[PDB]
Amino acid sequence: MQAIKCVVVGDGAVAKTCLLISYTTNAFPGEYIPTVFDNYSANVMVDGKPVNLGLWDTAGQEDYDRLRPLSYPQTDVFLICFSLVSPASFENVRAKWYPEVRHHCPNTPIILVGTKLDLRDDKDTIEKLKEKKLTPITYPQGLAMAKEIGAVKYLECSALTQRGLKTVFDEAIRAVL
């Protein structure tokens, strides 16, 4: 019986915390109760034996780049995250998140994950991005980013649908396994 370290970072403009809580809550889609605290955890069976795990929820505010790294050491796996519908999130991750995460921990299995996949194909959202001159950036260039790092997996999920979300965590925990 053992536990697994698992960190998640990302800008505060995507609310990955909602994803994490809705997963751990086993919440019905669009039914999660937002708690007042961070750093969620769960006890998970996937294969062979069940394990514990704690999700290092890290706020993406740039100032906290001095407390985020102290959590990094001895991390089993880290989950880099973004918003599939935010080009600015892409600029952040390829420019700030991915680089400094790679520098702090160049040696750890890594998986990149999309968000608002439901909004990725949302006609109103994509037309708003176009009229605001942002791009509904799609999967293949996400795969290009993955191959750029060679992250052991790249995934795309959503909160209001939880699609592949369970899967997301499955390959996340099987990264060690």
Binding site: F28, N43, K166
Partner: protein, 275 residues
């Protein structure tokens, strides 16, 4: 049949369901069934009816003997059922029957030997808490006992909600999901095209008797967190008030729904309609 009180064929189907649950290794359920059988038995000597004399073996079988043999097997099942509390409960009374009526102390020795193994198991190791879901069957294509009926399923120890959802979908064609998790659908209260919805529920804690203020360890209560349960609540998010941006507690209202089922999980059946 229990209504019709023809106890013999009742026992026959008891054993049928025992075969089924054993095929599913549902030791808890199988042993509960054998318990239901043993319930009608007494600790008296005289075998009152050969109706309780079944086809497995048939000779004198003093009422006492059949009851104790059943109890023995039930204890075996609880042991491999990882529910040693009930095992202990029946072990005590098997012992007292030995003491007061048969005076065969060798049975005492073996019985309580296993009893020690049980206590060791219960304090020593840890076991996962099974999740519970609320299954609301709706539509009209459902059978009589399923139409517009809500059940609770004692799923596996770590079934994610939609894993069990899919498992049920395998159990049922026309496998769709209504999205208004809380209310039923009045059209679907009569319409065909069976509609269902599933979601995890909160296992309301038990009330361990004589424990309400005792400084007991955690193991006993963790046992009591999952089993011997009938009460179930579900937290209901709601907006009631102004939806100010920086704040949500201007509108947070939780319309929890308690669920009281006829029987106690776990039971002979791994699910039950909410009574």
């Amino acid at each position: 049949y229990k209504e019709k009180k023809r106890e013999d064929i009742y026992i026959r189907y008891l054993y049928k369901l025992r075969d089924l649950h054993r095929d599913c290794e549902n030791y808890t359920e199988a042993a509960y069934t054998l318990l239901l059988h043993a319930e009608l038995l007494q600790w008296s000597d005289k075998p009152c009816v050969p109706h309780l004399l079944q086809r497995d073996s048939y000779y004198v079988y003093t009422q006492q003997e059949l009851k104790e043999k059943l109890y023995q097997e039930i204890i075996s099942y609880f042991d491999k059922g990882k529910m040693w509390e009930k095992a202990i409960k029946l072990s005590k009374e098997l012992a007292e029957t030995y003491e007061s009526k048969v005076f065969d102390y060798e049975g005492l020795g073996n019985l309580l030997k296993k009893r020690a193994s049980f206590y060791e198991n219960i304090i020593k190791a840890m076991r996962p808490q099974p999740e519970y879901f609320a299954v609301g069957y709706y539509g009209q294509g459902f059978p009589s006992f399923l139409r517009n009926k809500i059940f609770i399923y004692r799923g596996k120890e770590y079934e994610r909600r939609e894993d069990f959802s899919l498992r049920l979908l395998t159990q049922f064609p026309n496998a769709e999901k209504m999205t208004s998790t809380t209310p039923p659908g009045e059209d679907i209260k009569s319409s065909p095209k069976q509609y269902m919805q599933c979601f995890t529920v909160k296992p309301v804690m038990s009330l361990p008797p004589s424990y309400k203020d005792k400084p007991v360890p955690e193991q006993i209560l963790n046992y009591y967190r999952a089993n011997e349960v009938q009460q179930f609540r579900y937290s209901r998010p709601f907006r009631k008030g102004e939806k100010d941006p920086d704040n949500e507690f201007a509108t947070m209202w939780i319309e929890r729904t308690t669920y009281t089922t006829a029987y106690t999980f776990p039971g002979i059946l791994k699910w039950f309609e909410v009574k």
